[PDB]
Design a protein around this ligand. Structure first.
Ligand SMILES: N[C@@H](Cc1ccc(O)c([N+](=O)[O-])c1)C(=O)O
Ligand SMILES: N[C@@H](Cc1ccc(O)c([N+](=O)[O-])c1)C(=O)O
Ligand code: NA
Ligand code: NA
Lengths: 308, 308
């Protein structure tokens, strides 16, 4: 398994694989990811931090951008309050075991040279393109603000300005990233992680939608959220419990079941779990019990560091 | 005639008259106008500079904003080239007899505090409103850029930032000004000048449309432009020659005519010229001859200073 294959594991796409391979040869290489600060850090965040850890293990210097100014532009509140949530997020990311440097967008995004660049990019970016790039990111607003279209060019210049080789984000960032690869002289390698389904199955997981498991949820809370989650027998597509099994659990996985329902089941890969679930050899209740118990153990060290 | 009435003369609107009156009482008061730098300075510019002179005579400190960064956002070229045209414009404005201070937008519009203000305003300004405010200003573009909607909030913050009591501009600026009066804590008094008709009568006069008389046009050039201008008998509405008579000429005005066509005509006011023209007592050819000759004399001192 290449460093390349370790990095590629469980990503949705890498733009491009050829470019990443060229990057991997260098002694010194950096990757960054930006997050609008979030009151709760959930499995979606953890999925991406896990990927940053993969990159770190492959010798990348990791930068976490606490995106206070973008969050401000996306109507998340006042900068001072946003920064405080950013600081909390840093502590959570540290509790996850990430070795990284942290920067606040506003530390450099209001510099004269940065701003001049933003305006230069604004001349090359159509309103239609800017709005399209924000469809999965923009806060819902019946009267869309000028701030909405400044946000994507702020993010485009961010990669350029700080000289990152690799930008990581969820699939929802991909249009902004495509714009960056088009507009900037140096092409940034983009690694996109899948977007987790919300627990009720009705859309994507999000801090604003209350459809997530937070990394510091209590065990009792995790069990309840999983008990109630969308998880139709035989259905893997859009099944958040199966997603958790794929992205977070380790294998071989032992699934405990009463003897009357077939007894304990040892599963050597997610792929084999998927076949058992599609073939209805594994019931949603037994899948859920195992996912809840293993996820609790996975998250325990993080919750404990945050509780201590 | 009040200072108020001197200021009001030949304006399209003042927002608001009550506010201007409060302003007039102060010992210290300033007014500014901004211009995207223009390769040619035309009668539209001169009309507004004349109004700045009125304000100066009423005891206002005048600031001319050479709007290099707005011009950049509105696709007028590179900043360095734009600034050079700005410097030329300053020399023309000085040749007009204006006593003012001149500043380049970019001297202060890229400051961290300015930019933070721009982003705060971007949160309060809808895209729909920003685009509407730019309809008569925005460079024609089949694929409108993000830069187009940054421009109006740049101009909104300009008035606020430099603490002007009064902003002057053409009617085309009125939506941006309305936005400023809505968004800022201090209401700026806005004085709007009429927009001159193009020489061919087919739209408004503009540097980009080649339908103007420039202040340094040669006498021969002025005569030719006027000879060819739209000027229907009896029609005052949208008649650029009648506009020049109203906004630039002094009265009493003597109109020279051959005896066979009624002989020389002395006109004591624009209002009386308008009645004679509507009643068809004054032929377009005779009106044009007088307007051309008087406009040449009006502009001679400006052209001469620029030629020297
Ligand atoms: N768009 C990201 C945040 C972000 C990512 C990368 C960035 O470079 C920046 N930025 O420049 O402020 C911001 C999000 O949805 O959470
Ligand atoms: N909109 C003006 C230029 C302008 C006027 C006033 C201003 O404050 C600024 N500005 O802030 O750059 C720019 C024009 O059409 O020529
Ligand atoms: Na080496
Ligand atoms: Na006094």
């Amino acid at each position: 398994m290449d460093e390349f294959e370790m990095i590629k594991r469980n990503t949705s796409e890498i733009i491009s694989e050829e470019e990443l391979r060229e990057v991997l040869k260098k002694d010194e290489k950096s990757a960054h990811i930006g997050f609008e600060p979030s009151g709760k850090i959930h499995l979606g965040h953890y999925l991406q931090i896990k990927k940053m850890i993969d990159l770190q293990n492959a010798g990348f210097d990791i930068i976490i951008l606490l995106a206070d100014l973008c969050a401000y532009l996306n109507q998340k509140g006042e900068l001072d309050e946003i920064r405080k949530i950013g600081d909390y997020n840093k502590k959570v990311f540290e509790a996850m075991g990430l070795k990284a440097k942290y920067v606040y967008g506003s530390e450099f995004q209001l510099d004269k040279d940065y701003t001049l660049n933003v305006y230069r990019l604004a001349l090359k970016t159509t309103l239609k393109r800017a709005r399209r790039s924000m469809e999965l990111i923009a806060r819902e607003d019946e009267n869309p603000k000028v701030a909405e279209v400044i946000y994507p060019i702020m993010q485009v210049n961010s990669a350029h300005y700080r000289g990152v080789d690799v930008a990581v984000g969820g699939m929802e960032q991909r249009k902004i990233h495509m714009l960056a690869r088009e507009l900037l002289p140096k092409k940034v390698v983009c690694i996109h992680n899948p977007v987790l389904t919300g627990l009720d199955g009705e859309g994507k997981m999000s801090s604003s939608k209350g459809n997530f498991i937070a990394v510091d949820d209590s065990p009792e809370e995790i069990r309840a959220k999983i008990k109630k989650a969308y998880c139709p027998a035989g259905v893997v597509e859009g099944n958040p419990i199966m997603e958790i099994a794929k992205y977070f659990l380790e294998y071989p996985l032992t699934i405990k079941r009463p003897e009357k329902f077939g007894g304990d089941l040892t599963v050597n890969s997610y792929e084999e779990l998927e076949s058992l679930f599609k073939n209805k050899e594994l019931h949603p209740m037994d899948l859920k019990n195992a996912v809840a118990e293993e996820l609790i153990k996975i998250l325990e060290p993080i919750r404990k560091r945050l509780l201590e």
